[PDB]
């Protein structure tokens, strides 16, 4: 029993975190094999950020201008290149702690673990989701740039996010490990804002199934709905549309609890129109949307890494 | 900016998890130096658990009855002894991945990270607190016994909890790393139930100071209160008494925000009376009590917004 916001064990990622310094700027790098990956804005001053020309700033740099520190050991930079908004530093030593890994680009609604780092040293681990507006609600202070997001599929670390910036609303933006931003953001000090956000419907449904598995059934009712009628109600409350793909993905949980997906949709409709009436679900007074159907199955079955 | 339920990076603990087998029973062990620590109920059958005589069950066991597996390597048990409710197995190999560590006994209200394991393999990491009734609200399935709770302040891992059992209400009970249970609980399947749980008042106050640091003041008011009048109100809402020790501990957060502890107590009294009226504090519609004053200082910025 129990249902907690759970992150993947971070050990395989901790062994890759390094400190990258370029002049007065210090941030975090990811050391895999003989390459260190970090945000390209490490080569900028506060002044450059206003309107940076990254190739022009990079051409003026030599290998010895980048200081890479792994623990208390200094690594030697023997090459440098740029791919989108990520700087790739070739080093003389391959990381002996390099795990089995892949670079993956995730979709909004997908969750991942974040290993927050400062000066190449991991400080904490938490779970979060890529919001429909492409931002993440992280917890990051100055110096956290270069911190990474990941998932573990069997024994392989899937790196999906690298941290670059904080928006005025306190939410966060970054790139995949190939340097492509999630969302309409740019790595420049200029006016940028998160768009209006929506609730991840398939995730709230998965979390309602996790509550049923744990004994919270007060919100169940005898009613059902059509997929079209549920989507008209979802549009009214700023919830993402539910597709037939989402219904198929919820199939295993629907069979385990004996509650059809459209039967659980009728419960969600009543919760939206009437509220919780002083009651809670899994210790929460809000409808939680940062657990995917896979996360629910994983936590209710004990999958190890 | 941001405020998340954050766990310590688990890497130092993942490198200590092993599988312990005794007959038909399999659970997790913690391998530090040349000793494996695990719950003593690993020597019991389901039948033994009603009224076990551990000394009598243990005297019938030899070193070669315990199978310890670290990764895909088998360890050799060369000694065994019992200390309170923990079994200590001496092995022929010292753990090369043993971190700098301490065994610490915590008080109710204190938080820690849990590395949930099955068959000696880590599955997830989450944050939780020792409830005032000495239980923890974890997320554990059968096979999770022997999973550990820890803090990693600075570079030293302080082990504070080892998982032993689930109570009928779905909550969890366990021991410190010296085998002493937290609470009036026994490693015996007897009529046992958690006492009435209460809210950790000093933690809710710390979390209100975090909300102020992150730029929110909607809940503050022009009032103050005496310590005694606050306690008479709080206990009617099932909140733990706030002691002078707790007031002293909140001193640093009070000086940073400029809000006196008894002024913050007045806001909490009003929030308990009025509810939130459709508003949230740090993304929550309930008052959060699983962040200590020390966790808030560790995560939040030193500059108030
Ligand atoms: N809005 C905003 C803020 C950011 S900033 O203006 O100081 N800043 C401009 C900027 C522009 C583009 C890029 Cl790619 C990076 C960056 C940097 C960036 O975001 N860094 C950070 C990242 N994370 C968490 C931070 C917390 C605190 C201060 C910086 C933080 C620096 C004030 C929060
Ligand atoms: N009530 C209850 C339950 C546990 S039990 O009755 O099967 N059980 C009695 C018992 C008594 C004392 C001691 Cl020391 C250990 C133990 C064991 C124990 O708690 N194991 C577990 C531990 N954690 C999480 C579990 C989840 C699911 C099943 C086992 C779980 C076995 C059914 C939840
Ligand atoms: Cl303590």
Short mmCIF file of C-alpha atoms and ligand atoms in Angstrom, two decimals, chain B residues 41 49 140-142 144-145 163-168 187-189, ligand 2:
data_model
loop_
_atom_site.label_atom_id
_atom_site.label_comp_id
_atom_site.label_asym_id
_atom_site.label_seq_id
_atom_site.Cartn_x
_atom_site.Cartn_y
_atom_site.Cartn_z
CA UNK B 41 11.92 -11.77 10.55
CA UNK B 49 5.00 -14.64 12.86
CA UNK B 140 5.69 -0.44 -0.27
CA UNK B 141 4.58 -3.78 -1.71
CA UNK B 142 5.37 -7.32 -0.43
CA UNK B 144 10.10 -4.31 0.19
CA UNK B 145 11.20 -5.32 3.77
CA UNK B 163 11.39 -1.15 6.69
CA UNK B 164 9.79 -4.08 8.58
CA UNK B 165 5.98 -4.05 8.18
CA UNK B 166 2.64 -2.73 6.91
CA UNK B 167 -0.20 -2.10 9.40
CA UNK B 168 -3.92 -2.84 8.63
CA UNK B 187 7.85 -7.67 14.64
CA UNK B 188 4.99 -10.00 15.40
CA UNK B 189 1.62 -10.38 13.60
N1 LIG C 2 -1.66 -5.87 7.46
C1 LIG C 2 -1.04 -6.20 6.57
C2 LIG C 2 -0.21 -6.59 5.42
C3 LIG C 2 1.12 -7.25 5.80
S1 LIG C 2 1.09 -8.96 6.31
O1 LIG C 2 0.05 -9.10 7.28
O2 LIG C 2 1.07 -9.78 5.14
N2 LIG C 2 2.50 -9.23 7.06
C4 LIG C 2 2.47 -9.46 8.51
C5 LIG C 2 3.73 -8.91 9.12
C6 LIG C 2 3.75 -8.67 10.49
C7 LIG C 2 4.91 -8.25 11.13
C8 LIG C 2 6.05 -8.10 10.39
CL1 LIG C 2 7.51 -7.59 11.20
C9 LIG C 2 6.07 -8.31 9.02
C10 LIG C 2 4.90 -8.69 8.37
C11 LIG C 2 4.85 -8.79 6.85
C12 LIG C 2 4.61 -7.40 6.24
O3 LIG C 2 4.05 -6.50 6.87
N3 LIG C 2 5.00 -7.26 4.95
C13 LIG C 2 4.88 -6.10 4.14
C14 LIG C 2 5.62 -4.94 4.35
N4 LIG C 2 5.44 -3.77 3.70
C15 LIG C 2 4.47 -3.72 2.79
C16 LIG C 2 3.64 -4.82 2.46
C17 LIG C 2 2.59 -4.73 1.50
C18 LIG C 2 1.83 -5.82 1.20
C19 LIG C 2 2.07 -7.04 1.82
C20 LIG C 2 3.06 -7.17 2.76
C21 LIG C 2 3.86 -6.05 3.13
C22 LIG C 2 3.72 -9.71 6.39
C23 LIG C 2 -0.95 -7.07 4.20
C24 LIG C 2 -0.33 -5.72 4.19
#
